[PDB]
Structure formats: structure tokens, C-alpha cells
């Protein structure tokens, strides 16, 4: 793969969103990956509905504001024959009755691919596919108050990662000699969190925060 | 006990602080309780050093930015014969070598009292003692993005509560007919979090978030 990738430069990535008081990060992660693949397919960047996922993907295994998996959301889009735009089906940060309307569907997928649990494999996927849905351990104040630089947390778990996010690239920091590699990660905690809503996560440091352990992307 | 208590009105409580990128909430919880008891004793409200706790209370069982217990901090203050002011020993949000200086000690304790694991018992303690150190489950985005009203999270755990905070009172909301009781809780996530750095937590709803399960106060 190349030494540094950033899909935001290529137009694959919508501005940062905010999940608010709802455990819906899986939905934001899934729409981010699907936004990337739809852009690759059509050349149109269109913001997708997390609320559509929160409301409607119960049958595939998701639980609205009480958690879910990106794969289950990709499975729902396949089963459902579509997904509504953010504009047509806006974000409410609470689970409600399904209101999917096929007239406003702007996205499709035919399934998903799970990536092998290795940072080498994640890197090849990020390089060649686009933004990748991943789950991380986000449960430390070091992450809550992250501002800049490469995030490294010596208590980070690589098991049962709670928080769905989006890898949009990777790179390295020139000015630091050791441990200088990072994943470029889009969060769903608003623009005011972290670096404009982004975090540089430690890369190739024993799968820090479990970042490569639950990585996947939708097929469109 | 009375129907509503708020120790902030009585002068027991310093302004809200920010723990930053460090798992030191136990230290903020402990200084808050000790600030309350010292004020009761002397009539002087003095901000106490969390950094002093982070740096120096290893021998009593604490682990700096990787966690700790309020009881271990109360034990350290007893063993150490004092605790420095915030001003003399400022907050750095990282563990460093102990720099305690007895010339700047402004607080003392002779131990601590653990409260029985019941909200009835917590209420009697808050009513008659002052601000009470407690641990809660803070590990949901519903808490991260809490803004106002009574916080209630149907997935909240009452086991292994991670996050040390300070109960400064309790009350009830008039305009709501059911589930209207709350604990008034000081956090250490800055003034910009929650309601000026405070949260109203559901009270008498089956020990929501484990709030009564690890409650204590220092004896001064
Ligand atoms: Zn999350
Ligand atoms: Zn905490």
C-alpha cells in the first residue's frame, strides 16, 4: 500500500455528524462506509440516514440507541432494497417506528466483506477500498478529551470494542522518530470533539483499541 | 431527611474542574468530598490538589491516570498527615513523582465512612454530612451528551461503576408527575459538560447507575 492515504481529499467523506444521547455510533459508522462506496460508484456524495438504520434494522439484529453492528446495518440495506437520504429522513437521536420510504432511497448494497483481524489487512483494505467501518474501545477520558497528536491509551482493550467509527485513512508523523504511525478516524461526536471531529489512532502498535478486530465495508 | 438538599447554596462546593485526558475522576471526587468537610470544619472553602492524590497515593492502592478509589485517597490523606492546596500543587492531568510539601497542606482527614448500599442511606448521608463521594456507570453517549433534565439510561449498570463523582444534593422536579426524583451530581468534565458541569441523576429508581453502591465520605 502507499505510505499515507486520506479519502477525505478524494471526496469520499461527508462532514462530521453528532450522534448525541444515543448509542447509535454503529449507524454513523455504517452510513460513513456506505457514503464512501456510493461516491466511488456514482461520483455523488450524499449524506445517508442514520435514523433509517436506528428505526428499521431491528430484524437484522440491531437495537436502536442500545447498540448494534455495522454488518447488521449493511445486511438491512440489502434486505430492504435501499436506504433513505439524511435529508429525507433526519436524525432524531431516539428510536421510533420505521418510516422508510423507497421514493427517497439514495443508496444500495448487495452485502458486505469482513476484513481479517490484522492491521496489515486493514491497511490494504483502507488503501484499495475506501473508508472502512471499525469498532474501537472509546471508554476512557483520554479519548473523551483527545485534542491532537497520535492517540495512545495503555489501558485500551482489544476485546468487546463498544464504539463504531470510520477509518478514512492512515499516515505517519514526520517530526516523531518512534511510534509515528496512525489511523485517521472519523468519529460521530460532532466537529467540536477531537481534531475537527477526527482522531489519529496509534497504528501498528499491537492492534491498539481493537481497531482491526471488527473491520468491514459494504459491497455496492 | 428534607425533601431537597443543595450544599452548593451552603458554600461547601468549589467551582467545577476538568480532569482532562486522565482517568483521575476518583481524585476529583475525593477532593470534592474533602473540600465539603473542611468547609464544614473551618468555614474556609479551599480548592484541594487532585495532582497530589494522582502522584502520591500509589501506596494506598491508587493507580494515577489508570484509576483509583476515593477510599484509597482518604486513606492516603490520613497516612500522609495532609493534602496540598490546588494552588500550591496544580493539576497536570498526568502522573509524575510525588511532590507533596507539608508547608502547603490545607487539609486533613482521620479516615472515612462507607455508606450502606441503599439510596435511603445515601439520602440520609447527603442530608446530614455534606457532599458524598460516589461511583457511577458513566459509559454511555447518553451521559457524554447529557444537557438537562433527569438523566435516565435503561442500560446503566449497578456493578463495577467506573466513574467517581460527587453528590452535592437531591431534589424533585415539580412539573413532572412520575419519576421526578434526582440526585444532584458534580462531575469533573469541565463547566461546558452537562448543566454547568452538573447532572441530575435518577433517584430511587433501583439504584440507577449504581450511585449508592460505592458511596463514602472522609472524617475530618
Ligand atoms: Zn459509542
Ligand atoms: Zn471517569
Swiss-Prot record, chains A, B:
Annotated residues for binding of Zn(2+) 4: 92, 96
Binding site for Zn(2+) 6: 160
Binding site for Zn(2+) 3: 71, 114
Catalytic-site annotation from UniProt: 25, 163, 187
Glycosylation sites: 108
UniProt binding sites for Zn(2+) 7: 162
Binding site for Zn(2+) 5: 137, 140
Residues binding Zn(2+) 1, per UniProt: 9
Name by which UniProt lists this protein: Cathepsin L
Gene label: CTSL
Residues of the full protein shown: 114 to 333 of 333
Amino acid at each position: 500500500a502507499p505510505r499515507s492515504v486520506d479519502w477525505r481529499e478524494k471526496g469520499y467523506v461527508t462532514p462530521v455528524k453528532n450522534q448525541g444521547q444515543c448509542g447509535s455510533c454503529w449507524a454513523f459508522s455504517a452510513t460513513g462506509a456506505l457514503e464512501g462506496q456510493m461516491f466511488r460508484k456514482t461520483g455523488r456524495l450524499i449524506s445517508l440516514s442514520e435514523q433509517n438504520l436506528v428505526d428499521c434494522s431491528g430484524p437484522q439484529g440491531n437495537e436502536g440507541c442500545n447498540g448494534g453492528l455495522m454488518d447488521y446495518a449493511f445486511q438491512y440495506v440489502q434486505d430492504n432494497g435501499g436506504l433513505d437520504s439524511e435529508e429525507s429522513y433526519p436524525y432524531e437521536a431516539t428510536e421510533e417506528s420505521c418510516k422508510y420510504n423507497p421514493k427517497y432511497s439514495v443508496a444500495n448494497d448487495t452485502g458486505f466483506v469482513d476484513i481479517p483481524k490484522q492491521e496489515k489487512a486493514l491497511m490494504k483494505a483502507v488503501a484499495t477500498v475506501g473508508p472502512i467501518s471499525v469498532a474501537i474501545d472509546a471508554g476512557h477520558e483520554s479519548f473523551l478529551f483527545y485534542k491532537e497528536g497520535i492517540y495512545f491509551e495503555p489501558d485500551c482493550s482489544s476485546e468487546d470494542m463498544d464504539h463504531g467509527v470510520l477509518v478514512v485513512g492512515y499516515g505517519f508523523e514526520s517530526t516523531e522518530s518512534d511510534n509515528n504511525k496512525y489511523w485517521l478516524v472519523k468519529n460521530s461526536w460532532g466537529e467540536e470533539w477531537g481534531m475537527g471531529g477526527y482522531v489519529k489512532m496509534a497504528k501498528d502498535r499491537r492492534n491498539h483499541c481493537g481497531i482491526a478486530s471488527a473491520a468491514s465495508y459494504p459491497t455496492v
